Amino acid sequence: FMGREVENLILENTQLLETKNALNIVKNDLIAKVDELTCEKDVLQGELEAVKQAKLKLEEKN
Amino acid sequence: AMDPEFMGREVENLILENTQLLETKNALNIVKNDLIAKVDELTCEKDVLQGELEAVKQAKLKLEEKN
Amino acid sequence: MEMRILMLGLDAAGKTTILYKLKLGQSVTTIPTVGFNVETVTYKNVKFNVWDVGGLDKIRPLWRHYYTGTQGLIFVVDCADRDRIDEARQELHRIINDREMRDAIILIFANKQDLPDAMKPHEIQEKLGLTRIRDRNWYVQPSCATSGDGLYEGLTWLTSN
Amino acid sequence: MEMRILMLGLDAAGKTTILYKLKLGQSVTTIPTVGFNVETVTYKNVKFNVWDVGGLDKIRPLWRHYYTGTQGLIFVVDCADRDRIDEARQELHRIINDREMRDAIILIFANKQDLPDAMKPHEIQEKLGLTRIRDRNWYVQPSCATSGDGLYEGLTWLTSN
Amino acid sequence: AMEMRILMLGLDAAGKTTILYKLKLGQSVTTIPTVGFNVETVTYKNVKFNVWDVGGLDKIRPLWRHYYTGTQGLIFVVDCADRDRIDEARQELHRIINDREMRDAIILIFANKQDLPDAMKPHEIQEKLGLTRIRDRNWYVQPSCATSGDGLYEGLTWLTSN
Numbered sequence A: 001f002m003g004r005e006v007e008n009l010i011l012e013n014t015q016l017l018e019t020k021n022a023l024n025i026v027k028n029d030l031i032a033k034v035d036e037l038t039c040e041k042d043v044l045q046g047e048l049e050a051v052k053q054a055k056l057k058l059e060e061k062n
Numbered sequence B: 001a002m003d004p005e006f007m008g009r010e011v012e013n014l015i016l017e018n019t020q021l022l023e024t025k026n027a028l029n030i031v032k033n034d035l036i037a038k039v040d041e042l043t044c045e046k047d048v049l050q051g052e053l054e055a056v057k058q059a060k061l062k063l064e065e066k067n
Numbered sequence C, D: 001m002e003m004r005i006l007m008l009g010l011d012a013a014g015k016t017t018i019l020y021k022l023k024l025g026q027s028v029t030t031i032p033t034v035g036f037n038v039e040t041v042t043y044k045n046v047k048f049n050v051w052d053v054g055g056l057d058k059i060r061p062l063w064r065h066y067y068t069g070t071q072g073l074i075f076v077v078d079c080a081d082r083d084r085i086d087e088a089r090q091e092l093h094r095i096i097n098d099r100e101m102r103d104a105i106i107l108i109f110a111n112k113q114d115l116p117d118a119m120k121p122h123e124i125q126e127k128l129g130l131t132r133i134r135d136r137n138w139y140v141q142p143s144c145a146t147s148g149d150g151l152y153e154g155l156t157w158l159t160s161n
Numbered sequence E: 001a002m003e004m005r006i007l008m009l010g011l012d013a014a015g016k017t018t019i020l021y022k023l024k025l026g027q028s029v030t031t032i033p034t035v036g037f038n039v040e041t042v043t044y045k046n047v048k049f050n051v052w053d054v055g056g057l058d059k060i061r062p063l064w065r066h067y068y069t070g071t072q073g074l075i076f077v078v079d080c081a082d083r084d085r086i087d088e089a090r091q092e093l094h095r096i097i098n099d100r101e102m103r104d105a106i107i108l109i110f111a112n113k114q115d116l117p118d119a120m121k122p123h124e125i126q127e128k129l130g131l132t133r134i135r136d137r138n139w140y141v142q143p144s145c146a147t148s149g150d151g152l153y154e155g156l157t158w159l160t161s162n
């Protein structure tokens, strides 16, 4: 009876723990990917700048 | 047999922890969804930039051939 | 035109092979995916954001956390794996009946068609329990990932639907 | 060199203004941030990935989920908002006492120094509980985010530490 | 009025004697470098400060330690226009406060000579004196100009309040 209140909260506790663990794994994977993508975007923007300047220098020579 | 005061402490402990866990599940779901949206946005923006690089590099090639 | 694609299926089915054959133009070496890959593939003026999520049994419970905003599901099946085609059916119907996935268009890649005794589309259709589903848009497309056979026909259907 | 930066502070402190002043070189119009902004800012040989997360009261519980991998905390304070300085103190100490934030270096932008009624850094040293922070590496930088005054000085401190 | 023993230290030329007499006499006086010490009593907000100003020239700094015992507050004065010697000031500050006989003293730092162009501000002083590294001590940085008196009573206020 008094044991029943406690058991039911405990069961609920274990499901919440499970989903929190799963969400944390996914969330952390997602953060890593955002950080990677922002850096990659930055590198590409720099690369694009350098090639665009190289076009104008080739047009100047030509 | 278990003391009522112990059973009460454990009931209170679990109510607090389950409330906290529910809040963080909700929070994590929100953060995950915000992160997914940003990943999609950044992936698209990266692709636009790759396409732009390839377009300019092709022009860079034709100008080297014309030189 | 933008479409968010979730690409699921059991481990070893060919998901990552398909993703990078489409993105990089060649069959690259793959290991079982921990986490996910995501790339933007443009074909027919439509820009597909394709999420490739690890299909190992251990990490399949994680798939549901990637459903948000999905407009099309790609479910990849290893057609030479008869021992797991029913496991694949169970996983498919799990996915499509989720609230976040109920409006999603369904493309099946009947993959690994190159192998000797591999199941045909209409058999894959039957084995995956799609036949009597009149309420959802679905299609079974035969494919070879490592050669790129069938892959762009798959995307054509997604663009069409 | 690479540094992951998390930028926190109460709503209206000036976090997004700072991010885009650094990134774009201009003062942009903003509204309260829902979710986050993230930009790569390059300065003095260091590539800062700066995460700017919304600071409205009801979304502060979201902050702790962005802590993972943070190497530097930027905490932004509206130095004219006298009525909320104690609130800012409470939030700052909650952040730095979290297990995932124990090793982060701490840059505090004492922001909105352009305002006639803005408090100076020395006026804030106990009101923000800074003098009682133990065993950490922290620094206060006066700033005006709209003009960019103080921002590169703050970034220099981060690079030097 | 409660009594409070104050030790005022800092590098030579920081402004200690200037501060002492500004507080004691209520007027700006010309100084010479201090060999030995000055001591004056100043009353403010119901506290009687007994302030010992001890010469800061390098070769007499070892004498500072003779004044540590009984000290309830340290005033450490820094010339904020002297960037070349800020590292030396940091070294001396940490030497003082780490002494067993100074462990219970509260610490007021006068970031002095704020009137001078390009003088280091309190926030810069915090960094250059390595204040972030101080553990289990009560400290505060007060900007000041000892020639005008600006900031000095704000400094004494902090001491009275602590």
Ligand SMILES: Nc1nc2c(ncn2[C@@H]2O[C@H](COP(=O)(O)OP(=O)(O)OP(=O)(O)O)[C@@H](O)[C@H]2O)c(=O)[nH]1
Pocket: C009, C010, C011, C012, C013, C014, C015, C016, C017, C018, C030, C031, C032, C033, C034, C053, C054, C055, C056, C076, C111, C112, C113, C114, C115, C143, C144, C145, C146, C147
């Ligand atoms: N013969 C043949 N092999 C394929 C085909 N597609 C993929 N493979 C191979 O199947 C193996 C597994 O492919 P993956 O792409 O890594 O499988 P996956 O679906 O991404 O598996 P997980 O990462 O665990 O989810 C690899 O050795 C691939 O080379 C195909 O169409 N035909």
Ligand SMILES: Nc1nc2c(ncn2[C@@H]2O[C@H](COP(=O)(O)OP(=O)(O)OP(=O)(O)O)[C@@H](O)[C@H]2O)c(=O)[nH]1
Pocket: D009, D010, D011, D012, D013, D014, D015, D016, D017, D018, D030, D031, D032, D033, D034, D053, D054, D055, D056, D076, D111, D112, D113, D114, D115, D143, D144, D145, D146, D147
């Ligand atoms: N006068 C003055 N206004 C500023 C300064 N910095 C930011 N602001 C203004 O303060 C308001 C809020 O700035 P935001 O950058 O959006 O604040 P935030 O910290 O990102 O707020 P949240 O997105 O809610 O977390 C805007 O109107 C800014 O223009 C400053 O240095 N001086």
Ligand SMILES: Nc1nc2c(ncn2[C@@H]2O[C@H](COP(=O)(O)OP(=O)(O)OP(=O)(O)O)[C@@H](O)[C@H]2O)c(=O)[nH]1
Pocket: E010, E011, E012, E013, E014, E015, E016, E017, E018, E019, E031, E032, E033, E034, E035, E054, E055, E056, E057, E077, E112, E113, E114, E115, E116, E144, E145, E146, E147, E148
């Ligand atoms: N411009 C400016 N000069 C100051 C200030 N405070 C002190 N001085 C000057 O700095 C010089 C040195 O001041 P002192 O008070 O003699 O320095 P001290 O710390 O007592 O030096 P020692 O006796 O060697 O320990 C004097 O010429 C003062 O007038 C200030 O706030 N601004």
Ligand SMILES: [Mg+2]
Pocket: C015, C016, C017, C030, C031, C032, C033, C054, C055
């Ligand atoms: Mg894979």
Ligand SMILES: [Mg+2]
Pocket: D015, D016, D017, D030, D031, D032, D033, D052, D053, D054, D055
């Ligand atoms: Mg904002």
Ligand SMILES: [Mg+2]
Pocket: E016, E017, E018, E031, E032, E033, E034, E055
């Ligand atoms: Mg003197």
